[PDB]
Amino acid sequence: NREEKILNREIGFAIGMPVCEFDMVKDPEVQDFRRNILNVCKEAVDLRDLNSPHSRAMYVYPPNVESSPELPKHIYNKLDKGQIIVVIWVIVSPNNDKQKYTLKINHDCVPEQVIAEAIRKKTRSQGKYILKVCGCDEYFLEKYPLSQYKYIRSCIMLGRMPNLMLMAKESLYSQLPMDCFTMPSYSRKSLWVINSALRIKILCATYVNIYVRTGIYHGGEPLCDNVNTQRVPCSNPRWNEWLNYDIYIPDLPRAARLCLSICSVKEEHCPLAWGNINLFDYTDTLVSGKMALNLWPVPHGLEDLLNPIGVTGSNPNKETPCLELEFDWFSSVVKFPDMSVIEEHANWSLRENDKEQLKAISTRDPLSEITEQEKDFLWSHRHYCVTIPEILPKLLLSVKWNSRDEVAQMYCLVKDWPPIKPEQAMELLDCNYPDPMVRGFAVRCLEKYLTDDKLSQYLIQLVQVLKYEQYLDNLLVRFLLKKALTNQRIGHFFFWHLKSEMHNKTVSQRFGLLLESYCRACGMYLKHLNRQVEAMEKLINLTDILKQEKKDETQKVQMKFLVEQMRRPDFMDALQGFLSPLNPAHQLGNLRLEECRIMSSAKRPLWLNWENPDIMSELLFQNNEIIFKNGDDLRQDMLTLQIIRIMENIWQNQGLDLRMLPYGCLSIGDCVGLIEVVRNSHTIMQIQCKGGLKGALQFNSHTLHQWLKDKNKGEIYDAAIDLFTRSCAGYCVATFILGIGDRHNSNIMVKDDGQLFHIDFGHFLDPFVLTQDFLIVISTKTREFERFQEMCYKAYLAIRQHANLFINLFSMMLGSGMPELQSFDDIAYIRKTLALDKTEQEALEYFMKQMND
Ligand SMILES: */C=C\C(=O)N1CCC(COCC(=O)N2CCN(c3nc(-c4cnc(N)nc4C(F)F)nc(N4CCOC[C@@H]4C)n3)CC2)CC1
């Protein structure tokens, strides 16, 4: 059992905690999860080794492609009569002489056709090759049309010219390890005949330093009124009381939970410690007998005396308030009925104006409240609503989940409900819908209609909604794990989104078990991941030192210390030669210390610089730069940049070229993160200072246009201006809709070619002062500003048509501890700025008026 021991050491390093901690967990659900998830592991491995080397090579090097092969009109127009010019590179002699061959080929050609044409053009002086992107580990291994590869479409939009390298397939396959996933060593009754009322005994409490407030909930809604116990003095926290609720035992839905908290009185009621318990365990058994639940500290800004959206389970730290409980015990062990009994009990238990009304209801947004009249209206028309599937969320919200009969009937309706878009299926995965059948339906919709591109695009939200799962073992987690173990690009960010939260002890168990399974089945990539981990490790340590020991020293003294520590051999091995967690296709070779530096003030961010060891680094970027910041929460930045990329995608696929810049930003831990470095970019303040009339002068705004004209002389000029306008327009709309924090001359940046973008998104959801610089680069009363206002109006409209998607994305992110996103009241800001309750012309006038100010 030696290979097993080495693998366990490596998984422990990668996860942070040792694997033997899991073994000591005497929880049946934990060991059952650990064993049962290996089925998904094995499915994924078998799919990897399914087709000899190619299957593995595409697991490790998946195609980075757009979901649709179709080209937007403006993207196709940029082609030369529908064709693209491409440079294919070949390394010939052992001296690595690079020889280039330029081709003009149809944009929809397959990599095989490109290789054929390249060899034809080369010999004018079989299928044993593959195409690599020059300068990074990205391959074109699949028979997609060239233009559908994200890199190629990017080259077509940016006017750059694609530079690919031809590579013998055997050279790549020889670099693929013979992955051996080894099986771990830890693998080898009534049915609500109880026609009664649910009652629970609160026994006593320990580690208390008042009354107990309890309730029965289904997600966020309460199935009956809350029940306060007898106010007892905190000296003797002993109640031994029986609480009876207005709920019949068989009326409890599958996902019924008990939410309790301990409260104090001054008059002034204050929560002290909260807790939540699954009324049914993972085996469908209705809990009975005694139960000790260790409670959790209250989160900041808690409205009520109960935390029902909080995670379920006993606090791992057992030296906390421990509440003792007793659940009724009946004839035998009680279990939730089988779907067959459900169908039996369901089978046992219309005007055109009304149809148009149902359609209009379905059209509304998620946050739009539905009236009780509308709820009963949707319910009385629950069979017609199967013709308009998207209305399913709202319909679900109209169910009385405290009634066995209605729950069974909705179950039947779901067993045959038509599939809906993934965008709309995700909404059914947030905290509003805990019912396992609805969640299964949403996961099935994702599994059938979600390409890996879109899966990557929404991976952060999917990982988040994981936390809303009632049990370790569920369909959503199995789906994500299988996609992660069959596509390494997805598995990279899967692993990192999970690890970045391992510090959160409310999700440590779930995410730790998940990471254990993943790392066990992920293959050789584990080693690579481990390297990344260690690197971050070192960085954190270093930065920690800088923020305490050498906290109050001068820039040059801190710089001397950083160059000293950075030069320690244990440190240099750790931070040289590994993959960029921001993008694993990017190798990071040796550190260029002469180029690393501490970034102005802040939490003392590190600006690091690596050589790019790619054989042809020069044709992409010879130096990669990243900002490691050990100070502030980056989750707000991640969500903002994801939304910006989604908005740019909408505008492109709709026909308005507003080039945004959603640069990379990855949260890797508790307030530790990485940020991409956009080359050839400067803040507006840097522009005004470099252009400062001189030493002892003001810094007027009129100089930005001069700086751009100096950096873009000749025919370039107009181009640059255009770029600047469009990007600017885009970001304006973006920042107005999301309500981003205070902008200023150092929050905004421009590149040497005119592109403008924003950075550091502190707070969102709680008016863009177009400088004279912006308006004069665009030129007040000019055709340029007319086109500018038209762009902005069109972009506002375009983003208003997808309001549901952004509202759902935020709703799903609510689960995260993100401060700027604690309640639906913060999200409502988007419903406000996009004028959802108003009409289209009304919202257009609203935006025009907001933009006049
Ligand atoms: C005229 C003399 C004078 O007074 N000077 C002081 C002002 C100049 C420097 O002013 C600020 C500045 O240039 N930089 C600080 C900001 N920085 C930056 N930050 C970030 C970023 C994003 N998010 C978060 N959470 N933190 C941070 C970071 F500040 F730590 N990102 C970037 N990136 C974004 C991607 O593209 C590149 C860019 C570097 N940059 C830039 C430097 C000097 C003269």
Distance 624 CA to ligand 1 centre (A): 17
- Cα separation, 175 vs 204, whole angstroms: 62
Q: Is 602 in the pocket of ligand 1 (CB under 6 A)?
A: yes
Q: Which residue has the tokens 């999970």?
A: 498
CA neighbor of 286 nearest in space, from 317, 264, 255? 255
Does the beta carbon of 666 sit less than 6 angstroms from any atom of ligand 1? no
Tokens 């490691």 belong to: 628
Read off the tokens for 597.
Answer: 């530096």
* Among the listed residues 46, 47, 55, the one whose alpha carbon sits nearest the alpha carbon of residue 173: 55
Task: Looking at the CA of residue 627, tell me the nearest atom of ligand 1.
Answer: 30
Answer for the pair 746, 685: CB distance below 8 angstroms, yes or no.
Answer: yes
- The residue whose CA is least distant from atom 10 of ligand 1 is 746
Whole-angstrom Cα distance, residue 734 to residue 459? 22
Is 262 within 8 Å of 293 (Cβ atoms)? no
User: What separation in Å is there between the alpha carbon of 683 and the centre of ligand 1?
Assistant: 7
Contact 427, 811 (CB under 8 A): yes
677 within ligand 1 shell (Cβ under 6 A): yes
Task: Return the C-alpha torsion angle 110, 115, 121, 124, nearest 10.
Answer: -140
Hey, how many other C-beta atoms are within 10 angstroms of the C-beta on 431? 16
Residue with the nearest Cα to atom 8 of ligand 1?
A: 686
Of 166, 505, 145, 51, residue with least CA distance to 320: 505
Q: Which approach determined this entry? A: X-ray
108 lines ligand 1 (CB under 6 A): no
Distance CA 548, CA 358 (A): 61
Q: Where are the domains of the chain?
A: 37-188, 197-327, 680-853
CATH architecture of 37-188: Roll (3.10)
Tell whether the torsion through CA atoms of 587, 590, 596 and 598 is positive or negative: positive
The answer to whether the CB of 148 falls within 8 A of the CB of 141 is no
Calpha distance 649→153 (Å, rounded): 12
**631 C-alpha to ligand 1 centroid (Å):** 15
Measured distance CA(261)–CA(273) in Å, rounded: 6
Helix (H, G, I), strand (E, B) or coil at 742: coil
674 lines ligand 1 (CB under 6 A): no
Picking from 452, 520, 508, 509, the residue whose alpha carbon sits closest to that of residue 480 is 452
Residue type, 474: N
Superfamily of domain 680-853: Phosphatidylinositol 3-/4-kinase, catalytic domain (1.10.1070.11)
For residue 760, how far is its CA from the centre of ligand 1 (angstroms)?
9
632 ligand 1 Cβ < 6 A: yes
Query: Cα of 648 to ligand 1 centre, how many Å?
Result: 23
- Taking the C-alpha atoms of residue 210 and residue 793, their distance in angstroms, rounded to an integer, is 57
The CB of 609 under 6 Å from ligand 1? The reply is: no
Give the three-class secondary structure for 404: helix
d(CA 451, CA 62): 12
- Ligand 1 atom closest to the Cα of residue 762 is 25
Resolution, expressed in angstroms to one decimal? 2.7
Which residue, judged by its Cα, is nearest atom 4 of ligand 1?
689
Angle subtended at Cα 582 by Cα 577 and Cα 585, rounded to the nearest 5 degrees = 60
775 lines ligand 1 (CB under 6 A): no
Task: State the distance from the centre of ligand 1 to the C-alpha of 315, rounded, in angstroms.
Answer: 41
* Residue 762 Cα to chain centre, angstroms: 18
The alpha carbons of the chain give a radius of gyration, in whole angstroms, of: 29
Q: Using CA atoms, how far apart are residues 295 and 276, in angstroms rounded to an integer? A: 8
- With contact defined as beta carbons under 8 Å apart, do 595 and 549 qualify? no
Distance 759 CA to ligand 1 centre (A): 8
- CA-CA distance, 315 to 79, in Å (whole number)? 60
Question: Would the CB of 759 count as within 6 Å of ligand 1?
Answer: yes
Interior/surface letters 282-306, b for 16+ CB within 10 angstroms, e for the rest = beeebbeeebebbbbebeeeeeebb
CA distance 721 to 714: 12
Q: What string of DSSP letters covers 653-686?
A: HHT---------EEE-SSSEEEEE--TTEEEHHH
Helix, strand, or coil here: 473? coil
Partners of residue 130 on adjacent β-strands: 167
Give CA–CA dist 823/828, Å, rounded: 9
Task: Determine whether the shortest distance from the Cβ of 598 to ligand 1 is under 6 A.
Answer: no
Cα end-to-end distance, the chain, whole Å: 72
**Closest to 426 in 3D by CA, of 388, 392, 382:** 392
Mutation pick for ligand 1 pocket among 598, 623, 686 (CB with most ligand atoms within 8 Å): 686
Q: Does residue 689 have its Cβ closer than 6 Å to ligand 1? A: yes
Q: CB of 770 closer than 6 A to ligand 1?
A: no
Count of Cβ atoms closer than 10 Å to residue 119 Cβ: 16
Structure tokens at 350: 């219309």
Question: Looking at the domain 197-327, which fold is it?
Answer: Immunoglobulin-like (2.60.40)
Ligand 1 atom nearest 746 alpha carbon: 11
Cβ 566 vs Cβ 542: under 8 Å: yes
CA 746–ligand 1 middle distance (angstroms): 7
- Atom index in ligand 1 nearest the CA of residue 692 equals 1
Q: What's the number of CA atoms in the CB half-sphere (13 Å) around residue 196? A: 13
Structure tokens at 248: 């019949």
Q: Which amino acid is at 22?
A: F
* Residues 6+ positions from 21 with CB-CB distance below 8 Å: 512
Q: What is the DSSP letter of 299?
A: P
Look up residue 694 and give its two tokens: 């001189």
CA of 740 to the centre of ligand 1 (A): 17
